[PDB]
Each structure stands twice: as C-alpha cells, then as structure tokens.
RNA sequence: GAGACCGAUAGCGCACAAGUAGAGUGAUCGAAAGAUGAAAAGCACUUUGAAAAGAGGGUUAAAUAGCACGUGAAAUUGUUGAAAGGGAAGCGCUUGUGACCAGACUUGCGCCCGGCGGAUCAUCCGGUGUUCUCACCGGUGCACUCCGCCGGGCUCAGGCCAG
RNA sequence: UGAGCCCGGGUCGAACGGCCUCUAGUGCAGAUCUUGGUGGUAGUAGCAAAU
RNA sequence: AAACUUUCAACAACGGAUCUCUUGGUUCUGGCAUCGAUGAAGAACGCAGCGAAAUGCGAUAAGUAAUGUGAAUUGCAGAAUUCCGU
C-alpha cells in the first residue's frame, strides 16, 4: 500500500512535513536522507529505505528498512557501523546498498561525505574558539535594562557631579595639595585665599 | 486507544485507562469512528486485546445490510503493476529518455 | 553612528512645569514665543510692561488682525495685542522657576530661558469649549568658555 | 473528571463564588496546611487556621519568617501574622498581606472545637485507610 | 436557531469509513503519518492479553 | 570556500514598490495596491504619466525567485531541530531564526548553525560576545 | 485616602472620580492653609523653625544604605572598618602588583574583533594619557587575535596597560581594563564594565579638546574594597603626577554603582554679585573659600561606566586556578536598591 | 448544567448609580460610563505658591504604572533640527546633492613528513542486548591498518566588479 | 508581480503562532452612512439663551 | 537672513484605537410547582457613630428568636464584647 499511505501523506497531512513559501517542503522525519519531503526520499512511503546518521559518540551508522519488517516499529531499521576511513566506508555502503535504489545510493553517499565534513568543520570551530576564548553571552534582560535606566537617572540626579567636581577642587585648593606657587590658581585670588 | 470485550474483560480498564491523560477507552461493539479518525486523520495508534479481535470478527459479520466492501483494485503495490514481466514484456521500445537533450 | 547633542547638566539646569492651566492656548503661545531664548530679567519686565500696557506681544502664528500700533516696529510685525493672563501665569511659573533654581544653587544672574514649550490641554467638558495649556519651561545659566594652557612640547 | 451533575465547571461560576463566597466558606477556603511533627502526631494534612496559630513562611519575599498569626482579614483573602511589616511613607508599620496557601502551620491553638475537628478528619483517614488495605 | 446544525450521514457511508479507518490503524506508518510516537512497541495493531 | 552555490545572476525587473493611487492624498488609503475599478480612471486605462500595474510580466525568474542577495533562500528557524533540518541544504538556505525565540535558544542555534555552516540573516539580536 | 483604595471600594468609575476630585481639592486647600498658618507662626517665633529643621528631614536612600555586618565580597565600608579597629591587608595580598612605586603609564587601546568603533576609541584612547590606539584586524578576512594573545604581545612590547572597547549597536558597550605588570609579573586583573551613555565632545554642546597636558584624577566615594580595588584601578591607568600648569580634571563619581565620568578644565575665579558661595554638606558655608568659585568647561566624553566582572588573569580563558573568578555582578545582589556593590 | 456564540461602539437598553441620570402636561422616550499596582506599599519630608499646579525627596521589578492610573494608533498640536517656497500643491520615469542607516565569500578542503593518543587494528580476552548476526560496553596492548591532535612542508579552490 | 510575509531597533507586559482540514456575524473611501474624537474658518463674528 | 507655509526625524501633548482580561449578556438542556383580605405585586416614610449610593430591615427597624459552624468585624472610631464557650 505504498502509493495510497503516499497520496494520503503528500495530499491530506503529514505531521513531518514542513511546508515553506520559498517552494520547498521539508520531511522532518528523523530517517529521512533528504531534508525535503518528496516521493523519493520519504521513510514512511518508501518501504525499502536505507538513511545514514550520527550517533552522538561521534560514530556513523547505515540503517535500512525493509517490507517483509515493515510491522514492528521497534526493529524497522538495521544499524551498521561505518569505518572512519572515507573511501571504505563508501565501499561498504556500496555493498550493503547493492541492488538499491542508485537515488538511495545517491544521498547515502551525499549524506555521509556531509557528516564527515561537518565533523571536521565542528572540530576546526572548537580548536578555534578555545584559542580565541571568546564565547557569546546572552544580552542584559528588558527589565534587567529598564532598572539601571531608572536608577541611573535618580543616581545622577542625586549626585549632581559639576557641583561634586568644584567641591573637590575647591578643597584641595585649601588644604594646598597643588603646593607653593600653584600653576592652577592665580597669585591674585591666591592672597584671598591666604 | 485500548479496545476491549465488555463481556469478557469487563468494565474496570475503563476507569484504570480513564484517569490516565491522553488515553482513551472504546467497546469493540461501539467502536466509534471520531476517535479512529481524529481530525480526519488515519491512523489511530489502538491497544487491542485477543478477545476485541474475535469479536470485530463477529460484529462485522453480524451488521445486517452491510458487506466488508470489495476494493477496485487487487494488488495495491503499483510498483507491482507496472514493473512486472507481462507488462515489461509487452511494452513496446521508449521513445525517449526522462530528460531530453536541447535541439537547437 | 550619530550621537545626538547630549542635554544639559540638570544640576545647571532648572525646569517648571504649569499643566492644566485654564488660560488660551493661542494667547500662552504667542506669549512664549515672545519671551522665548531672553534674559530672565528681560523676560520678567517684559511680561510686566506687557500687564502695564507699554510692550507689545506680536502675533504670527495664531494672528487676528486687532492692533495696528508703534509698538510692533521692535518686532517687524504689524499685528501686536497684550495677553494679560498670559502674562500674569508666565510671570508666575519664571518665579517658580527660578526659586527653583535658587533652591539647587545655580547663579540667579544669568538664567536664560532655553526651552518653552505650550501643548493643547483636555477641553473642558461644558456647543462653547474652552482651551487649556500646558506649558513646560527649561532654563540654564549661561554656557562658559574659559581659558587653555599653552601645549607644552616634549 | 467530574460526573456528578451538581458540580459546575464553568470557570465563570467557579470565580463568583470564589469572589462572593460567606465567611465560613471563606475560612474552608483559607485552610492551611500543617508542618511535618504536626502531621506525623495528629495524622491530618490540613486544617482551618484562627487567630493563635504559630506559623512559618514557605512562598513570597518574606521566606522563612516566623511568627503568631494578628489577624484573618477574610474580605482580602488574606492573614497578617506577627513582625512581618511594612513601613508606609510616614513611617508607619502595616502588616504585610500574606496568603494562608503561602504559609505552613507550625503550632495549633486547641480548643474543644479543634480537637473536635482534628479527631473527626483523622477518623476519616483511619477509616477509610483502613478500608483499602483489607 | 433553526440553522442546520446536524448532518445525516449514510450508515453504510460510516460503516465504510470505520472500516478504512481500521485499515488504516493497521497500518503502520500511518501512525507517524497521524504524529503518534511509535517506535518502541513490537507490533503494530499490539493485541494484549484479555488475562493481564 | 563558503558560499551559496554558483546561481543566475539575479535580476530584478521592478524594485520600487505598486502603490496604491491617491494614496498620497488621503491618510485613510494605505499604500497597499489595490486595482481600480473606474470605468475612466487614468491609472486603469494605463494612460502615460500614470502609475504602473502589477502584472506577471513584472513577475520575475524562477531560478532567481525567493533568493536573498548573498543567494541564500530564507528558512524561518525555531530551534536546533530547524537547523539539523537546513543540515544537509545550506548551500541554498540561510536561517532566519523566529522573532519569539528567546536568547539562549538563539545562542543554540547560532552555535549549531556555525558548526554546521549554515549562514545566519539575525545573529546578532539579543545576544553579545564575552572573553 | 491613604490606606483605602477607590478603585476597590467604589465600583463606578464616574463616582469615583467625583470623590477623588472632591477629596484631592479639599485636602490641597487643607495643607496649603496648614502650611500659611505654620508660616505665620514661624514668622513670629524663629525657634521652632529651627527645631523643624532639625527634626524633619528629606529621606535618603544614600543614608538608608544596608552595609553587611574583607574578602572582596562583603561589601563593608574600609574607613569603617580602620576606625573600628582604633577604637587592606587582603586587597594587597591578592592584588600585590595594584598595591611600590607604578611604572609611568603606557596604554595599548584596541576594540572587539572587526569592530566600527574606531572613531569612539581613538576618543578613549585621547582620554587616557600615553596610550596608542591600533585596529584589530585592518580588514575583514584576516587573521584573528586573541586578548590573550594581544596582551602578551603588548606585555612583550613594554606597554603596562591594554583597554578593550567592546561593541554593541555600533556604539561603545563594554571596556575590559587588562593590566600588563611589570618584568617577570604575570598579566593581571581585568576589570570589565558597561560603557553605558556615550556621548562625544563634538555632540556634548559648550566643549573643548584636552590638551597634551597630564590631567588631575577625581575618585569620588569608593568605599567598600571592590570600589578601592576599581579606583585604584583607574589611578595606575592615569599617571601619578599631573601637569598642574595644564589645569585639566578627570573625575569618576561613584553613587549607587554607577561610576560617572566627566572631564572639565580649571578656571579659580572670583565670586561675582549674583553667585553664591560654595555651601558645605553637614558643615555649610566652608571657611576660607569665601569669595572664589571653580568655572568648569566639560572637555571630555560623557559616558558611564559599570563593573560587572574583575577576573585574576587576562579574561576567563586565561583565569585558570580554583579562584578564577573574584567578583561577577549579579541581579539577585541587585535585587535590594539599599545594596551597594560598588 | 452546558456552548465550534458576543467579548465593553460587540453581547439584553443596563458587566458600573440602569429602566438610573435626563426630557415631556401626559401616555411614553431613555442614555453615556469596565482595567493603577502582587500587595496602597496611594508619594513621608523640604521648598515654590490660592492650584484639579511645580522643584526636590521617597514607594515599587517598573511611577513617561500616581486614583487624569493594563498597552497606548491615526486625525490634530507644540518645541528642537534639516531643507524648500517669484500667481497651487501632490504623483510617474531618471540621475545628482545633503542627511541618516546597513555592511559584501559564513572566506577551506586536500596531500606529504616527524611526534603523540585513540580506535571495525589484534584471526586478543570478558560481559550484555539483539532483527541471531549484527551492535554496545569492560580489560590488554600498537606488530600491521585506520583516525585524529600537535609541529613542520607543498598545492589548490574560491564571492563581486572592471580591462 | 500583487494582495501580503519574515527579520533588525524601541516600547510592552501574558499569552501566541506555522500546516491539514471544519466553520462564519470574515477583508471598506465613499452610502448628504452610525458612533466617538479632532481641524480650518478663528482668538474671527459678537458680549446676545446657555454657560 | 528672520516671520509665515510645506515635508521629514526626535521628543512632548490630545485621543482612546489594537492585544489581553471578564462576578456580564445570548442560546440550548435537565429537575420541581410556590403570590394575595392570616393583607399580594407596587408606591412612600423612617431605622447606622461617621451614609453619600446600593442592600437589608420596620419604632423588637443594616434588624430579634432557634439551630448549625467554631474565634471575628474591618474604611475609620469600639467594647472591661467574646475564646475549653449556650
Ligand atoms: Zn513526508
């Protein structure tokens, strides 16, 4: 029944798919090679299905999905763990896919090499942030925000600073902290202030 | 959705499931097509039991007036139906491939 | 980017505030507009000449032709009238204004009005509508310029 | 859910008799739970309070205060208990509005009544414990 | 309020669709088609025992 | 080399927008178009000196269609489930995280989505970099 | 009307607003006659003016400050604690390179990596005397470096101070304060704080430039040792000696946590008719200054700063002992208004 | 007791003083009008001054939340700033000047050396789950193989615009 | 192309959206349209009832 | 050049639109049968410490008796009013 579970999950609804406006929509279906909800790739109406996928240990596994196991949603799919050589681990999905779909064999490989590079990519940002040292902190939340605004409006109204700086001036010009003959004041001014 | 026998398992799964959120509980006498269906979507996940299956056998040759349908077609599989020996064999040559080259 | 000019120090400003004041709001702009950007002084003898009789508040925006006078040659205007309330209710907020002003301890001197600004109160709910102003008054002592040391060279 | 008929769901109904319910409902709906050595000796989760109850704070800015319930303003839903106040702008204390939800029995000021009411509930429970285990 | 409210549908129209949507349960991946998570079960319909 | 894949130069027929007519005049007529329906009006009969009317004709390429200038086609994304779902097609996607998105789901997205190279319209919306 | 809310007694909003029109006009015309009646008797009697002035005065939250009752984390008042003692250790022994002369000071000002900023800093780095501003990058796809990396190429270099102005909005954001030491002294505390309103002296009306001359520093009211920490801080960024023939003033205000900085430049002039003289606080009307006031032309950058992390080496990445981190500011220690960090 | 109802110009005329206020001789006609805040904690006190008014100062997470109070559009108005104006304005195509704002490819893979560590490496040992032949762990090692990390070395590829 | 959609900045404080369907009290410039608010006339006419 | 007029930006006025909320309204359904000469529906006048409005009450007048619950009223004044208690 795989052209009517078709027709009712590309006509009616699938709770996988992500339509956009951009004209793609996308399968958000974990199993899915492609990230694009069409006939050829789509987990639930291709029976015989294969689809490549990380684990988080940093291992690669090759999964597949076959008809006469199509009930038991616990052992639909097969894991086969994939050499970290690029080369042989092609190799062997080219074995372990023989006689598949060459679409299927397609996306395999484009979703393996994809992995791989994304990877390396991973691997290179990390050692890249580390010897930078940078990381990216969240902004200061509104209301966080809204409070220094009002407190350092009421802050600076109570501390009128212009009269704070001549206060300060004026009583170092007394206590004589700019010395004999001081090149701030004038000599004048200076006897009144003697 | 768990289906049951009222006259072989009971009532009590009835209230055991009806506290517990999310999960219903439906007769297979009553079997009601608003929750097989919900929103119009196929594909109701349902517990069943043995005795709910002996007895949708029974009720589904006991409705009077009504016939398990007979479908238009008999091999779903339209892969089967074109990719098959018979037809591969009586096609004639392609004119074409799925991609043509431009002319001009 | 662009920084807009920051505003002046509080501490050498002061601000008054009359709101819901049951005076025309054409007549108090005018008003302002007259005495706005002057001397405090200058402003207060105005207003009070104006009482008087002898000065003349010139109109432009908001201006119905009532007198054609001498008084309007200081101003280039030929239209020229005498709002007494208006007068009176400015003269009040500049004294509120610089007892406030005196009360932060700025020099009484020198105040000069920078900002004056008239808005459209709620109309008074009696077909005769009256017109409330707001007016909000900001004031600074004269800006300073003082001397440089000469650069020395090293 | 609710099966019996003459209880409502309606939110609508539910507020206004919240919002207009008479004292004695209001004091029903201003019980307040006990603390642990409370609930360990009389074997009751939670009774009504009254004006002599010792009490501690477990929700709010005033966590973990201690002190004798004031008063029962049942009009605002609310209790004020002993040295948790407020100074208004003059200076004068008002006792901070705390809710008997927010706060947790520590000592019970018994009476006849009470005990009445602590033994009658805890009968219950013995009862009715006692029913589903044989 | 004499607005049409109820509809009448055929018996032999609901029948019908029951049976389809019965079918339908049957199937797995409709199940994921109509977003529930199965995944850990080992059968589709899971008949259980009328005993446990 | 980071970059959308090799496109169609994009060509853009019309960039200034349809507005609608006598908007200009009266406040109440937002510039929204909206089509005539006088039998003599001078921007229906499309005389010269008029206002232009939309048409499929202004309607542009299907190879350039929905594409942004860096040549990346907008992906409003959510989370890292959204990002994990532009993974295998960022050479012609760009997220564009939602507006709702709180700060350090946002973090979270540009992290995986700098891991994963898939550019980032808003990276910079509540957030700010720390040493 | 002062301890029950109309809102909640009366339930129509017209009536409501009647009582509250009624009420307020009553009780202005209440007080006013109150206050002329009090005006009239202390008019006639000078003495218990006196005593109101004495007995009542304006609310303070400066005076209804909470203290806790030295470990940079108690914020203590160090006067305090001196006089107590008559009647800090802990600081130097943390910080033994702040804490004995100071090399003269030499600045190395950069930004935050491909930032736009420049114009802002080269300000920054006008303020600050003897300080060098240079770009990070010098264009877009260059190589990257790290502020560990900057200031050991600095320290190298025989600078003793890096200032990083971080970005935000294309507007200065943040200032990460790195000290470079002396000799074999391993790179030290960075103070990072919050440029908040920057604002130019070309926008700032009533300016100047600074001149070349070396400016007098200002450090107004740091009490507890976080704040002896920042000001000393700030004082071996600025030189010890200043040119006192260039009468320039730097000054950094601190109240409530919100460090102000302002610079203006001297004029001691004789108090004209119309002034006053400068009255003192708690001790009006100082003695000896009876006739001179201080003119003040801004000449400097308006902006205000605030700490929120002091680390132990150059950034986090860079603190790396168990003591990593010594102070980061917090919301929740900002919760009461009456709490001080500074 | 409920709703695939309406949500303060809607829903009964009335969510609130509603058949109230008010009009008419009379039978009768008949409105407008909800929201501070979690809690009044509803602005103490000083200082202007005749007021439904301000300046300080205080409460609150916030008072440009102050009983004119959840948010606060447009019409209309004022101040500041820029530009323009010889008997209409406004609009279209196309530059130019000024002002403000934004920020281009997100900028890397590959090979070759020396070291280091991990592993479908070992016909290595042990355990577990399983689609019973595939996985995942615990334990040894580095002879071979494969990965990385470091320090060298070489190459290539790239976005746009001009000639 | 378009009706419209997404994001950036500010404000703001309690709920909201994308898709498949189902439903309707579903899209405004006119109606000397209804209600409410606000302008020029105009600080003009005139001090007239009301206020 | 100013004034005046026009466009735009920031800010401030007016105004109550948008989002949110609802002790409300509308419709449907289920259970029961109950006004009055033993004075009905309705109108008026009074009763509180401060009562304007609303509600309650009727010279025993924001009400009395009896029963039940079990420690309040509450905007302010107040009790020597009442707490193992008719
Ligand atoms: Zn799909």
């Given at each position: 029944?795989?052209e009517?579970?078709?027709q009712?999950?590309?006509?009616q609804?699938?709770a996988?798919?992500?339509?956009?406006?951009?004209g793609?929509?996308?399968?958000?279906?974990?199993?899915?090679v492609?990230?694009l909800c069409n006939r050829?790739?789509?987990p639930l109406?291709?029976?015989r299905?294969?689809?490549?996928?990380?684990?988080?240990?940093?291992?690669?596994?090759?999964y597949?999905?076959?008809?006469?196991?199509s009930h038991?949603?616990?052992?639909?799919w097969?894991?086969?763990?994939?050499?970290?050589?690029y080369?042989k681990?092609?190799?062997?999905?080219?074995?372990?896919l023989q006689?598949?779909?060459?679409?299927?064999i397609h996306?395999?490989?484009?979703?393996?090499?994809?992995?791989?590079?994304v990877a390396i990519?991973?691997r290179?940002?990390?050692?890249?942030?580390?010897?930078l040292?940078e990381?990216?902190?969240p902004?200061?939340?509104?209301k966080?925000?809204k409070?220094?605004?009002?407190?350092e409006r009421?802050?600076?109204?109570?501390?009128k600073?212009?009269?704070?700086?001549?206060?300060?001036?004026?009583?170092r010009?007394?206590?004589?902290?700019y010395g004999?003959?001081?090149?701030?004041?004038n000599?004048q001014?200076?006897?009144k202030?003697l | 959705?768990?289906?049951y026998?009222?006259?072989?398992d009971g009532?009590?799964?009835?209230?055991?499931?009806?506290?517990?959120?999310?999960?219903?509980?439906?007769?297979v006498?009553?079997?009601?097509?608003l929750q097989?269906?919900?929103g119009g979507?196929?594909?109701?996940?349902?517990?069943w039991?043995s005795?709910?299956?002996?007895?949708?056998?029974?009720?589904?040759?006991?409705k009077?007036?009504?016939?398990?349908?007979?479908?238009?077609?008999?091999?779903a599989?339209?892969?089967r139906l074109?990719?098959?020996?018979?037809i591969?064999?009586?096609?004639?040559?392609?004119?074409?491939?799925?991609?043509?080259?431009?002319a001009c | 980017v662009?920084?807009?000019?920051?505003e002046?120090a509080?501490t050498?400003?002061?601000?008054?505030?009359?709101?819901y004041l049951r005076?025309?709001?054409?007549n108090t702009?005018?008003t302002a507009?007259a005495?706005?950007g002057?001397?405090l002084?200058?402003?207060?003898?105005?207003?009070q000449?104006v009482?008087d009789?002898?000065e003349?508040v010139?109109?432009?925006?908001?201006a119905?032709?009532?007198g054609?006078?001498?008084?309007?040659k200081?101003?280039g205007?030929?239209?020229?009238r005498?709002?007494?309330?208006?007068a009176?209710?400015?003269?009040?907020?500049?004294?509120?204004?610089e007892a406030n002003?005196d009360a932060?301890?700025?020099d009484?001197?020198?105040?000069?009005?920078k900002?004056?600004?008239?808005?459209?109160?709620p109309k008074q709910?009696?077909?005769?509508?009256?017109?409330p102003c707001?007016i909000?008054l900001?004031?600074?002592?004269?800006?300073?310029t003082?001397?440089?040391?000469?650069?020395?060279?090293? | 859910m609710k099966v019996?008929?003459?209880?409502?769901s309606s939110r609508?109904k539910?507020?206004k008799?919240?919002f207009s319910?008479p004292?004695?409902?209001?004091?029903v709906?201003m019980?307040?739970?006990l603390?642990?050595?409370?609930?360990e000796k009389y074997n009751?989760?939670?009774?009504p309070i009254?004006?002599?109850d010792?009490?501690?704070?477990?929700?709010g800015?005033?966590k973990d205060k201690?002190?004798?319930?004031?008063?029962?303003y049942?009009?605002?839903?609310?209790?004020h208990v002993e040295?948790?106040?407020?100074?208004?702008?003059?200076?004068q204390?008002?006792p901070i509005?705390?809710?008997?939800?927010?706060?947790?029995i520590?000592?019970?000021?018994?009476?006849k009544?009470?005990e009445?009411?602590?033994?009658?509930?805890?009968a219950?429970?013995?009862?009715?414990?006692?029913?589903?285990?044989? | 309020?004499?607005?049409?409210?109820?509809?009448?549908?055929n018996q032999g129209?609901?029948?019908?669709?029951?049976a389809?949507?019965?079918?339908?349960?049957?199937?797995?991946?409709?199940?994921?088609?109509r977003?529930?998570?199965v995944?850990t079960?080992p059968?589709?319909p899971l008949?259980?025992?009328?005993?446990? | 080399?980071?970059?959308a894949?090799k496109?169609?130069p994009?060509?853009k027929?019309?960039?200034?927008?349809?507005?609608?007519?006598?908007?200009?005049?009266?406040?109440?007529?937002?510039?929204?178009?909206?089509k005539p329906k006088?039998?003599?009006?001078?921007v229906r009969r499309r005389?010269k000196?008029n206002?232009?009317?939309?048409?499929?004709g202004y309607?542009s390429?299907?190879?350039?269609?929905?594409?942004?200038p860096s040549?990346?086609?907008?992906?409003?994304?959510?989370?890292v489930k959204?990002?994990?779902?532009?993974?295998?097609?960022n050479?012609?996607?760009?997220?564009?995280?939602?507006h709702?998105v709180?700060?350090?789901?946002?973090?979270?997205?540009?992290?995986?989505?700098k891991?994963?190279?898939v550019k980032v319209?808003?990276?910079?919306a509540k957030?700010?970099?720390?040493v | 009307?002062?301890?029950?809310?109309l809102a909640?007694?009366?339930?129509?909003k017209?009536?409501?607003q009647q009582?509250?029109?009624?009420?307020?006009?009553?009780?202005?015309?209440?007080?006013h006659?109150?206050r002329?009646?009090?005006?009239?008797?202390?008019?006639?009697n000078?003495?218990?003016?006196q005593?109101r002035?004495e007995?009542?005065?304006?609310?303070?939250?400066?005076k209804?400050?909470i203290?806790?009752?030295?470990?940079?984390?108690?914020?203590?008042?160090?006067a305090?604690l001196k006089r107590?003692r008559?009647?800090?250790?802990?600081?130097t022994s943390?910080?033994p390179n702040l804490f004995?002369?100071?090399?003269v000071?030499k600045?190395?000002?950069?930004?935050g990596?491909?930032?736009?900023?420049?114009?802002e800093?080269?300000?920054i780095?006008?303020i600050?005397?003897?300080?060098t501003?240079?770009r990070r990058?010098?264009?877009?796809?260059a190589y990257k470096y790290?502020?560990?990396?900057?200031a050991?190429?600095?320290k190298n270099?025989?600078y003793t101070?890096?200032?990083?102005?971080?970005?935000?909005?294309?507007?200065?954001?943040?200032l990460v304060?790195?000290?470079?030491?002396?000799?074999g002294?391993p790179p030290?505390?960075?103070?990072?704080?919050t440029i908040?309103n920057?604002?130019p002296?070309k926008?700032?009306?009533?300016?100047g430039?600074?001149?070349?001359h070396?400016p007098?520093?200002?450090?107004?009211?740091?009490?507890?040792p976080?704040?002896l920490?920042?000001?000393?801080?700030m004082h071996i960024?600025?030189?010890?000696?200043?040119?006192?023939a260039?009468?320039?003033?730097?000054?950094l205000?601190?109240?409530?946590?919100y460090?102000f900085?302002?610079?203006?430049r001297?004029?001691?002039r004789?108090?004209?008719?119309?002034?006053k003289?400068?009255v003192?606080?708690?001790?009006?009307?100082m003695?000896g200054?009876?006739?001179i006031?201080a003119?003040?032309?801004?000449?400097?950058?308006?902006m205000?700063?605030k700490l929120?992390r002091?680390?132990?080496?150059?950034?986090?990445?860079?603190?790396?002992?168990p003591?990593?981190?010594?102070?980061?500011?917090?919301?929740?220690?900002?919760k009461?208004?009456?709490?001080?960090?500074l």
């Open positions: 029944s795989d009517i579970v078709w009712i999950i590309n006509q609804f699938c996988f798919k992500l339509k956009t406006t951009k793609q929509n996308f399968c958000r279906n974990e199993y899915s492609s990230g050829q790739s789509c109406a291709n029976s299905y294969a689809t490549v996928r990380q684990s988080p240990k940093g291992t690669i596994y090759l597949i999905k076959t008809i006469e196991r038991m949603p616990s052992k639909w097969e894991k086969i763990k994939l050499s970290q050589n080369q681990a092609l190799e062997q999905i080219d074995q372990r006689f598949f779909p060459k679409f299927l996306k395999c490989k484009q979703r393996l090499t994809r992995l791989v590079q990519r991973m290179r940002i990390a050692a890249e942030e580390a010897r040292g990381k990216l902190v902004k200061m939340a509104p966080i925000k409070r220094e605004e009002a407190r009421k802050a600076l109204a109570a501390a600073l212009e009269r704070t700086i001549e206060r300060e001036l004026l009583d010009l007394r206590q004589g902290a004999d003959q001081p090149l701030n004041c000599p001014i200076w006897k202030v | 959705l768990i289906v026998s009222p006259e072989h009532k009590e799964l009835v209230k055991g499931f009806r506290n517990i959120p999310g999960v219903e509980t439906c007769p006498d009553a079997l009601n097509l097989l269906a919900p979507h196929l594909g109701r996940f349902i517990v039991t005795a709910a299956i002996k007895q949708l056998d029974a009720v589904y040759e006991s009077k007036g009504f016939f398990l349908p007979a479908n238009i077609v008999s091999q599989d339209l892969s074109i990719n098959s020996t018979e591969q064999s009586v096609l004639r040559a392609p004119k074409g491939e799925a991609r043509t080259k431009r | 662009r920084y807009a000019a920051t002046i509080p050498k400003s002061a601000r008054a505030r009359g709101s005076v025309s709001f054409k702009r005018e507009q005495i706005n002057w001397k002084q200058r402003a207060l003898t105005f207003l000449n009482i009789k002898k003349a010139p109109m432009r925006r908001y119905g032709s009532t054609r006078t001498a008084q309007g200081q101003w205007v030929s239209r020229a005498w709002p007494v309330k208006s009176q209710f400015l003269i009040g907020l500049l004294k509120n204004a002003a932060k301890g700025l009484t001197g020198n105040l000069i009005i900002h004056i600004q008239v808005n459209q109160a709910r009696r077909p005769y509508m009256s017109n707001h909000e900001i004031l600074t002592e004269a800006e300073e003082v001397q440089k040391s000469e650069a020395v060279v090293r | 019996r008929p003459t209880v409502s609508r539910a507020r008799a919240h319910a004292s004695s409902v209001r004091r709906i019980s307040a739970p603390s642990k050595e409370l609930r009751v989760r939670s009774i009254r004006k002599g010792e009490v501690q704070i477990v929700r800015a005033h201690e002190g004798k319930v004031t008063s029962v049942r009009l605002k839903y609310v209790i040295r948790v106040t407020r100074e208004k702008a003059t200076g204390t008002v509005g705390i809710h008997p939800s927010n706060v947790v520590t000592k019970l000021h018994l009476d009544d009470r009445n009411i602590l033994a009658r509930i805890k219950g429970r013995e009862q009715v414990a006692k029913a589903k285990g044989k | 309020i004499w607005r049409k409210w109820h509809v009448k549908i129209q609901k029948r019908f669709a029951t389809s949507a019965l079918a339908a349960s049957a199937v797995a991946p409709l199940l994921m088609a977003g529930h998570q995944s079960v059968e589709v008949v259980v025992d009328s005993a446990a | 080399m980071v970059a894949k496109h169609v994009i060509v027929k019309r960039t200034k927008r349809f507005m609608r007519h006598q908007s200009d005049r009266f406040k109440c007529l937002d510039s929204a178009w909206r006088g039998i003599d009006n001078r005389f000196g206002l232009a009317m939309p048409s499929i309607g390429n299907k190879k350039t269609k929905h594409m942004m040549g990346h086609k907008a992906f409003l994304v959510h989370n959204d990002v994990e779902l532009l993974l295998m097609h050479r012609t996607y760009a997220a564009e995280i939602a709702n709180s700060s350090r789901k946002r973090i979270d997205i540009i992290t995986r989505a891991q994963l190279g319209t808003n990276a910079k957030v700010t970099t720390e | 009307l002062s301890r029950v809310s909640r007694t009366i339930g129509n017209l009536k409501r009582l509250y029109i009624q009420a307020k006009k009553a009780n202005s015309r209440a007080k006659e109150e002329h009646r009090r005006r009239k008797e202390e008019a006639k000078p003495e218990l003016k005593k002035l007995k009542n005065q304006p609310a303070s939250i400066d209804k400050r203290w806790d009752d030295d470990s940079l984390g108690a914020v203590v008042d160090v305090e107590r008559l009647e800090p250790d802990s600081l943390q910080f004995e002369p100071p090399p000071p600045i190395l000002v950069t930004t990596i491909n930032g736009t900023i420049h114009k800093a080269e300000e780095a006008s600050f005397p003897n300080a501003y240079i990058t010098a264009h877009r796809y790290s502020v560990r990396e900057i050991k190429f600095a270099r025989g101070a890096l200032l990083v102005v971080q970005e935000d909005q294309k507007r200065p954001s943040r304060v790195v000290h470079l030491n002396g000799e002294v030290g505390p960075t103070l990072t704080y908040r920057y604002a002296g926008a700032i009306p009533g300016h430039r600074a001149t070349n070396y007098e520093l200002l450090l107004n009211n740091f009490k507890t976080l704040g920490l920042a000001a000393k801080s960024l600025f030189p010890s000696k200043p040119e006192l260039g009468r320039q003033v730097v000054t205000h601190n109240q409530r946590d460090i900085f302002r610079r203006h001297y004029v001691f004789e108090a004209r008719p119309t002034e003289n400068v003192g606080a708690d001790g009006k009307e003695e200054v009876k006739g006031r003119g003040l032309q801004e000449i400097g950058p308006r205000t700063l929120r002091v680390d132990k080496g150059v950034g986090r990445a860079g603190s790396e002992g003591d990593a981190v010594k102070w980061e500011w917090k919301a929740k220690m900002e009461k208004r009456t709490r001080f960090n």
